[PDB]
């Protein structure tokens, strides 16, 4: 979907010949969604306040529908909410929550949770409304910068291991987001790791090191791990990758608090565990503007980082260089107790021309451009997409 | 591990967005400069050999087009809310120079005016008249489509671009498509994805 | 229809002051092209030329901003059109007004 | 300063028929390239102008084949091959040389 309203299919295979374009007359786009699970059938919505159901066929597509919505009002963007259920919520500018139910297709809480640089909300659905259910806003010096939930995930491994055949119980709690808030003068990046549901913070981390706030900072958010990124002086004018790790208990053996048979545990109530964390961080050569992660349809390998530079380049990085509860490697010398193969804390991590995708191309992703992680089988191998100004794909 | 498919599984598009000025060079005369897709604190800035799709090279510069300006060529720019100003030369974007005293100089880029010198469409069709002796050399169909001449060179390097369809842009030579291109893909905001995909006992055994 | 103008302004102005209606554009291709206006006067007729460039081309029977791309005009009742011009003449312009704006009604009374 | 001037002002045609309009102005239109700048516009009611010819006998782009033009100098024509009840609404010139005006309202009343 294009900034301009145009929709169009282009092939993954023989080098994006375009497969087949349609001309909406929304006179901008905002977003995408596949009306049910067939993959047959989108949603379109107007920047203006209609939308367009279209239906997508090895013939090229046509219009099955045009309408309003409720209110003809300027929409900011829409949040998917459930595929079964068939409702989206639209947050118009002006600030204004829309619960949509679009059509047949042809308690029971749901929590829905969005974010402005004046703070983090969170919202609530009942009863065919939607109701605040707190909120939380930083004060006037501060603003919120950068933002990330958790993407869901299918499991593998509830603990990482040690050596002598020992477990630490890696930290699985799904209702979590994280977030970062800069504050001028304070020269204080704050980093703080939100249950989403209720507004416990569990977590903070400052770092007074002279952060500039005028280079980009960015936050993607891992299996049981985050990672956010800023820019400062103080360590040395470099960037800055910053890792936490969140782990059940951080001695060498302990489920805390985790037993599953029918214990049940509720979100809603706050009775849930808390973690412990261990962070470090990394000395990294160049400025990063963005990060997200690669995937298959199994989180099996590692999980493989990916980065997006200034300077339009893009680079991976995999997960087991950035691992918290290093050592410096004098200590590891057969100190059994560790990891298998647990690759040293070494901090400094030096740009390998290896690992770049976009070997040769320039790829200039203009000013607003995303990274997106697109499955595929073959589980070795996976998809990671650059669209925005330009589209590329690897 | 790159070098068996460095640049066959590597896959780039390279999208400029709708023109919005173009201007010729100063050398490798079939060769301009094409800016696009403004913004309130950039726009696109590239160097492109007229007679193919291939562009020579992009900067996102971070002024908006209406600063940017010949000179008195040298392709001025000039900051408006400050007194900066950047000289970059045409054919290899090298920042020539940098002030903040005062502007070297500036000449609003100069209209189309390509009718009543080379242009004329009379019977639903393009007839290329030379100023004097109007001849109507090389006449060209109108396409289904057609917006705009962008540009035409009338030089020996002969070419002519043709915004024919909203998206779709003609570049033409000495008439004979030369070469297309197609622009509608130059932001995309949202995205989603398809796939494609391939198309009692006793009688068990023997069938 | 893609490439296509909107028009905002106010429903009522009194007799006897100049006229703010302000285009929108949300399609590419702004500099090369002469943005004009049209009044329709209820009573069978339509009359305007004002048309405009990237650069000053003021010529009256009119700001722009480049930034927004938002034409705008200040000058009795009629209807009022946002339109696209072609751009072939060197500072006249060709006319060929397609794409047209979808219309505001002015009602000119106290 | 050119004033145009419709001759028909209401033209009652049956469906299907080859039909034209006339229009005639005050000046001469001819450029020196050879463009005579006039330009024929479509309104069925309820919607904004609709452009159909751009210089007097040529078309513009997302026109129907149907309709053609001729002319020259100070007069002009519209001419459709075939007519059908769709193309109802009024019809107006428009000449580009100096301060177009709108001078027209050709009203097809296709009901006899």
């Known amino acids: 979907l294009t900034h301009d309203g145009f929709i169009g299919g282009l092939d993954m295979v023989n080098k994006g010949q375009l497969i087949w374009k349609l001309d909406l007359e929304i006179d901008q786009g905002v977003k995408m969604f596949w009306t049910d699970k067939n993959h047959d059938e989108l949603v379109v919505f107007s920047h203006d306040g209609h939308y367009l159901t279209i239906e997508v066929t090895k013939d090229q597509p046509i219009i099955k529908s045009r309408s309003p919505l409720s209110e003809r009002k300027t929409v900011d963007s829409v949040i998917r909410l459930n595929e079964h259920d068939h409702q989206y919520l639209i947050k118009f500018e002006d600030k204004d929550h829309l619960l949509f139910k679009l059509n047949p297709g042809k308690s029971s809480h749901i929590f829905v949770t969005e974010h402005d640089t004046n703070g983090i909300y969170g919202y609530i659905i009942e009863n065919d409304t939607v109701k605040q259910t707190w909120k939380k806003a930083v004060n006037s010096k501060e603003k919120m910068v950068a933002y990330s939930k958790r993407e869901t995930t299918n499991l593998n491994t509830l603990g990482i291991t040690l050596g002598d055949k020992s477990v630490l119980y890696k930290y699985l709690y799904p209702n979590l987001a994280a977030y970062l808030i800069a504050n001028e003068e304070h020269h204080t990046i704050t980093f703080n790791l939100i249950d989403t549901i209720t507004g416990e913070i569990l977590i903070t981390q400052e770092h007074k090191d002279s952060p500039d706030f005028r280079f980009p900072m960015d936050i993607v958010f891992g299996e049981y791990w985050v990672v956010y990124s800023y820019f400062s002086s103080e360590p040395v004018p470099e960037q800055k990758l910053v890792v936490v790790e969140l782990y059940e208990s951080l001695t060498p053996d302990e489920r805390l608090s985790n037993s599953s048979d029918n214990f049940s545990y509720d979100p809603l109530t706050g009775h849930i565990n808390k973690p412990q964390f261990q962070t470090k961080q990394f000395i990294f050569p160049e400025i990063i503007k963005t990060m997200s992660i690669s995937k298959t349809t199994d989180d099996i390998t590692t999980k493989a980082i990916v980065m997006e530079l200034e300077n339009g380049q893009i680079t991976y990085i995999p997960k087991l260089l950035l691992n918290a509860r290093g050592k410096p490697a004098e200590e590891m010398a057969k100190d059994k107790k560790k990891e298998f193969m647990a690759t040293p804390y070494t901090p400094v991590i030096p740009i390998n021309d290896n690992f770049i995708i976009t070997h040769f191309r320039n790829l200039l992703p203009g000013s607003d451009s995303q990274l997106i992680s697109i499955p595929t089988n073959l589980e070795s191998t996976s998809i990671i997409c650059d669209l925005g100004l330009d589209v590329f794909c690897t | 591990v790159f070098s068996d498919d460095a640049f066959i599984t590597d896959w780039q598009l390279a999208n400029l967005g709708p023109w919005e000025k173009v201007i010729p060079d100063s050398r490798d005369r079939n060769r301009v400069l094409i800016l696009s897709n403004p913004t309130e604190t950039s726009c696109l800035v590239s160097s492109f050999n007229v007679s193919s799709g291939q562009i020579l090279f992009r900067n996102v510069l971070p002024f908006t087009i209406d600063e940017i300006q010949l000179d008195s060529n040298a392709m001025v720019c000039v900051n408006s809310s400050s007194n900066h100003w950047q000289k970059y030369d045409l054919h290899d974007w090298f920042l020539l120079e940098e002030g903040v005293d005062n502007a070297p100089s500036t000449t609003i880029l100069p209209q189309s005016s390509y009718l009543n010198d080379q242009v004329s469409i009379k019977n639903n069709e393009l007839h290329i008249l030379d100023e004097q002796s109007k001849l109507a050399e090389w006449k060209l169909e109108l396409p289904q489509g057609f917006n705009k001449v962008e540009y035409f060179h009338r030089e020996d390097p002969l070419a002519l671009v043709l915004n024919v369809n909203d998206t779709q842009y003609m570049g033409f030579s000495a008439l004979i498509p030369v070469w297309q291109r197609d622009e509608w893909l130059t932001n995309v905001v949202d995205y989603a994805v398809l796939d494609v995909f391939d198309s009692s006992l006793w009688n068990a055994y023997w069938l | 229809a893609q490439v296509q103008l909107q028009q905002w302004g106010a429903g009522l102005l009194k007799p006897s002051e100049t006229l703010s209606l302000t285009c929108a554009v949300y399609?590419?291709?702004?500099?090369?092209?002469?943005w004009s206006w049209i009044r329709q006067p209820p009573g069978k007729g339509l009359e305007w030329i004002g048309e405009?460039?990237?650069?000053?081309?003021?010529n009256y029977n009119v700001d722009t901003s480049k930034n927004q791309f938002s034409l705008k005009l200040s000058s009795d009742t009629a209807v009022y059109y946002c339109?696209?011009?072609?751009?072939?003449?060197?500072?006249?312009?060709?006319?060929?007004?397609?794409?047209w704006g979808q219309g505001t009604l002015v009602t000119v009374s106290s | 300063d050119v004033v145009m001037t419709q001759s028909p002002l209401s033209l009652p045609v049956t469906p299907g028929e080859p039909a034209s309009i006339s229009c005639r102005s005050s000046?001469?239109?001819?450029?020196?390239?050879?463009?005579?700048?006039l330009d024929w516009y479509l309104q069925k009611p309820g919607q904004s102008p609709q452009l159909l010819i751009y210089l007097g006998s040529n078309r513009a782009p997302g026109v129907p084949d149907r309709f053609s033009g001729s002319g020259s100098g100070t007069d002009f024509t519209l001419r459709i091959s075939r007519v059908e009840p769709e193309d109802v609404g009024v019809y107006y010139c428009m000449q580009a040389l100096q301060t177009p005006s709108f001078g027209g309202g050709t009203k097809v009343e296709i009901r006899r």
């Open positions: 000046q001469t239109l001819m450029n020196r390239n050879g463009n005579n700048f």
């Open positions: 399609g590419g291709s702004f500099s090369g092209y002469y």
């Open positions: 405009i460039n990237h650069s000053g081309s003021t």
């Open positions: 339109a696209r011009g072609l751009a072939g003449r060197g500072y006249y312009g060709s006319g060929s007004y397609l794409r």
